[PDB]
Design a protein around this ligand. Structure first.
Ligand SMILES: Nc1nc2c(ncn2[C@@H]2O[C@H](CO)[C@@H](OP(=O)(O)O)[C@H]2O)c(=O)[nH]1
Ligand SMILES: [Ca+2]
Length: 104
């Protein structure tokens, strides 16, 4: 079963931890990759009910299993905070415009 389901993409907790670790590392080094400069600040316009405190940062999680290194970020993102705590997993899939919805 999927720990997180983003559209047709299935993710396990291990997939999320691996992606989060990569994104947090770049965050601590102040380095960014991709046209959207990930890891990027996530303002939570959607108003998701995250249990951990902000600031939040979004980092792409890929359905291929590989860690994001630039290029197309796809539609899914892992959101983490300054303490390297997981806030949630979100996606543009099934969301209007440039908004996000949570993966179930
Ligand atoms: N939907 C959404 N986009 C945000 C938020 N904070 C920052 N953004 C950024 O703003 C852009 C959308 O206006 C997003 O790019 P993306 O659409 O390429 O993912 C994303 O990087 C937020 O809270 N919600
Ligand atoms: Ca996987």
């Amino acid at each position: 079963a999927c720990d997180y389901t983003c559209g047709s993409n299935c993710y396990s907790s291990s997939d999320v931890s691996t992606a989060q670790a990569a994104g947090y590392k770049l965050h601590e080094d102040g380095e960014t990759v991709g046209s959207n400069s990930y890891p990027a600040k996530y303002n939570n316009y959607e108003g998701f009910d995250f249990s951990v405190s902000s600031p939040y940062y979004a980092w792409p999680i890929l359905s291929s299993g590989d860690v994001y290194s630039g290029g197309s970020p796809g539609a899914d993102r892992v959101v983490f905070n300054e303490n390297n705590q997981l806030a949630g997993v979100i996606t543009h899939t099934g969301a209007s415009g440039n908004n996000f919805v949570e993966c179930t």
